[PDB]
Ligand binder design. Structure first.
Ligand SMILES: CO[C@]1(C(=O)N[C@@H](C)c2ccc(-n3cc(F)cn3)nc2)CC[C@@H](c2nc(C)cc(Nc3cc(C)[nH]n3)n2)CC1
Ligand SMILES: CO[C@]1(C(=O)N[C@@H](C)c2ccc(-n3cc(F)cn3)nc2)CC[C@@H](c2nc(C)cc(Nc3cc(C)[nH]n3)n2)CC1
Lengths: 287, 290
């Protein structure tokens, strides 16, 4: 079937460009674990023609992995080969010839955005300003603009899936559900667009909805979307035009931007260029 | 939406939630108590399955589907549904409480907690292990008769109730097969590779005979007292390993007869595997001959 064909392809040593010798990777501490995989910090010797050791993150599966988890890992690898942008997590390669499948990616020293924010606190505890957050959103929007031009739909945009690198640079991560636009879903209900929920449709404009949820997570420094509303009742609330209210410590201009990402009609949402543009304008205008 | 079935709906105010017995990424099982449950006077200890805030539509759909399936099935070795609260908030599924937890959990504890395995409800012999497998085969026999495929048979998905009685659980992945005697779907499954029959892995086909393969894995689990299948082999290696005809070795605690039954469960051709009624008979014969 499709997976056996991808696994067999992958285990062929064909593209030397993305195949990294296992003996030059030294796995370090576990950065984090799910039910079916984990991320581990590592060092890689002579990665991509670089001197000495480069610190990397390594994604791998656990023993109880399903075909679904193996397909998402292989899918992520196949997608990140074609992308390069400063605010998208970089792929360095994979180990496909000795032991388990390992994906080698860019290390971002600070972890997930959601974590980084929940550690934080706002100011006019780690201290962040409105200019900081707007910077964050803008970085993500630039990365999303780039993806949308390559006609990639990310599907899983959320603060849990953005990483924070040195210099507080944002890296969009977790491409295992992405699809090249050019069945029941596995994206959490509370980040999905109404047409995704009712019609199982994903487009860049459903990424723009998810972006509005992610915007809300930023300004609330890691809040949980629609608190006290169970995922199962959200279908109905949204269909009748309820949305999250304007949060505390959030401007009228930011909130408007949010609400527009959540228009029922995908055509009436902004595109990522407009979202970037709004953010560029807010920042010059706050100096 | 979800259509209230009064036969099953339970008053939210009569349910009290306690500790988390365990959790995954998207959901939880919690220990609970239910007042005036299905006629019983007073409180009854039960277990409740529920979603977390990050739930996906697939996870909702699976919880609903476990609810659906459980309404139709009734057997001594299938976990009993009591009801659901599906109206004034989160969907809660109310099921029988099995006090020893999962089978894999229970067996792994008997490695270290005396009197342990011997050849108390904690003293275990090969005869007890044969019986646990037989109870499960009977429950699977009944499910196959009801035209279901479980798909996710594993020691982690069996519960151990008072009297060490086996209860098949975790019906979120089970599917009806009345037309065709198979369930197929185009996308990739969410059952762990190491329990999947070969034709499920390669061809996406699930039948009672792929549940037989998974039962075979479960037998190896049971005889290893909760061992991990294909120890140290990466999951993606199973495609090649299985198609080149390799199978797990006979574990040290296992009779020739028992291992023969396992290997029969893992025949490449699904028609060459025994059916659940044959498996139950094989296990009966083993039990009585000692
Ligand atoms: C959200 O990411 C984390 C997490 O716990 N994820 C869990 C839930 C998770 C689920 C599934 C799988 N899978 C891995 C597979 F191959 C398949 N699934 N791995 C991990 C893991 C890593 C993360 C992290 N922390 C720090 C301090 C640094 C850091 N740097 C990174 C991480 C990366 C990729 N680059 N740089 N990452 C912290 C949380
Ligand atoms: C295999 O089940 C356990 C487990 O950790 N399950 C995890 C992995 C898990 C994953 C997904 C979700 N989801 C729940 C959803 F709604 C959807 N997913 N919940 C839990 C949770 C229950 C279990 C347990 N321990 C003891 C001592 C008793 C006990 N008794 C029970 C349990 C029941 C149902 N009846 N009686 N159960 C321990 C292991």
């Amino acid at each position: 079937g499709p997976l056996s064909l991808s696994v067999d392809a992958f285990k062929i040593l064909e593209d030397p460009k993305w195949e990294f010798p296992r003996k030059n990777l030294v796995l370090g501490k576990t950065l984090g674990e799910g039910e079916f995989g984990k991320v581990v910090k590592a060092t890689a010797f002579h990665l991509k023609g670089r001197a000495g050791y480069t610190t990397v993150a390594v994604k791998m599966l656990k023993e109880n992995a399903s075909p679904s988890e193996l397909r998402d890992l292989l899918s992520e690898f196949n997608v990140l080969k074609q992308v390069n942008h400063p605010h998208v997590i970089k792929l360095y390669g994979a180990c496909s010839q000795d032991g388990p499948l390992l994906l080698i990616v860019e290390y971002a020293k600070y972890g997930s955005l959601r974590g980084f924010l929940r550690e934080s606190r706002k100011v006019g505890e780690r201290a962040l300003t409105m200019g900081d957050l707007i910077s964050f959103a803008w970085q993500i929007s630039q990365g999303m603009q780039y993806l949308a031009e390559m006609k990639l739909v990310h599907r899983d945009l959320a603060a849990r899936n953005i990483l924070v690198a040195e210099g507080r640079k944002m890296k969009i991560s977790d491409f295992g559900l992405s699809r090249d636009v050019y069945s029941q879903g596995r994206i959490p209900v509370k980040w999905m667009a109404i047409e995704s929920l009712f019609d199982h449709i994903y487009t860049t404009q459903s990424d723009v909805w998810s972006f509005g949820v992610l915007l809300w997570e930023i300004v609330t420094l890691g809040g949980n979307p629609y608190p006290g509303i169970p995922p199962e009742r959200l279908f109905n609330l949204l269909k009748t035009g309820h949305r999250m209210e304007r949060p505390d410590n959030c401007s009228e201009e930011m909130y408007r931007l949010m609400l527009q990402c959540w228009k029922q009609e995908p055509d009436k949402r902004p595109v990522f260029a407009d979202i970037s543009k709004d953010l560029e304008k807010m920042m010059v205008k706050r100096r």
